[PDB]
Paper text:
The crystal structure of a dimeric form of FraC in two crystal forms at 1.57 and 1.60 Å resolution sheds light on the initial events leading to the assembly of the pore. These two high-resolution crystal structures are virtually identical to each other. Suitable crystals were obtained in the presence of POC (a compound that mimics the lipid headgroup of DOPC and SM) and the detergent dodecyl-β-maltoside (DDM). The protein–protein dimerization surface and the non-covalent interactions observed in the dimer resemble those between residues of the β-core region in the transmembrane pore (rmsd=0.4±0.04 Å). In the monomeric form of FraC, the side chain of Phe16 is inserted in a hydrophobic cavity of the β-core region. Second, the serendipitous capture of a dimeric form of FraC exhibiting a similar protein–protein interaction interface to that of the pore, suggests a mechanism initiating the self-assembly and metamorphosis of FraC.
Fragaceatoxin C (FraC)11 is a potent haemolysin of the family of actinoporins, defined as a group of ~20 kDa protein toxins produced by sea anemones. Actinoporins are classified as α-helical PFT (α-PFT) because the transmembrane pore is predicted to form an α-helical barrel. The lytic activity of actinoporins on biological membranes is enhanced by the lipid sphingomyelin (SM) and by lipid-phase coexistence. Here we reveal structures of FraC corresponding to four different stages of its activation route, namely the water-soluble form, the lipid-bound form, an assembly intermediate and the transmembrane pore.
Numbering used by the authors: 2 to 179
The structure:
């Protein structure tokens, strides 16, 4: 199912699937469709999303096996408030460590831009404001620049992902063995 909250075969993840998910959110000024393909060799178990800005009405997909991708979404808080969708998703991996993913889709593009990041944290660590600060300010996040970026994560893993630049945002990440 190309529906937020679903887990799909990981080879099925791509821009078309995420655009469907994004569109299905409707007319909201700032929104995101997130897809993350687990090709890490270990099962992932959802912990939480820390929403610095915005909300989601989707259950964070609980179990994501190797060879599956998760689909997710978020959107700005409702009403005229001039805020975006910003947060960190945290999954526990079966080795006892944490996969964290930052997204930032800001309201005001005169000052801010789209960013994303991926990091592995040692141990089981829920997403929170400190994790957000680290990933957004200190751990060299990638711009949502309509381009692909790759980086090693340690722990025998690497990441490759893409985010666009606008307020109707797609974030596609693949986690693979190094
Ligand atoms: C990410 N940020 C909070 C530093 C700026 C953009 O967030 P927002 O105020 O538009 O929600
Ligand atoms: C994300 N960053 C803090 C590394 C660079 C600043 O980007 P922004 O908050 O001005 O968009």
């Amino acid at each position: 199912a190309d529906v937020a909250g679903a887990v799909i075969d990981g080879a099925g993840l791509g821009f078309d699937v995420l655009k469907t998910v994004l569109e299905a959110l409707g007319n909201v000024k700032r929104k995101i469709a997130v897809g993350i393909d687990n090709e890490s060799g270990k099962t992932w178990t959802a912990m939480n999303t820390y929403f610095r800005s915005g909300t989601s009405d989707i259950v964070l997909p609980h179990k994501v096996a190797h060879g599956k991708a998760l689909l997710y979404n978020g959107q700005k808080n409702r009403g005229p408030v001039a805020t975006g969708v910003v947060g960190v998703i945290a999954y526990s991996m079966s080795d006892g460590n944490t996969l964290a993913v930052l997204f930032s889709v800001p309201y005001d593009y005169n000052w801010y831009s789209n960013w994303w990041n991926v990091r592995v944290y040692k141990g089981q660590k829920r997403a929170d404001q400190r994790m957000y600060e680290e990933l957004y300010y200190h751990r060299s996040p990638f711009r949502g620049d309509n381009g692909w970026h790759s980086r090693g994560l340690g722990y025998g893993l690497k990441s490759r992902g893409f985010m666009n630049s606008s307020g109707h945002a797609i974030l596609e990440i693949h986690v693979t063995k190094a």
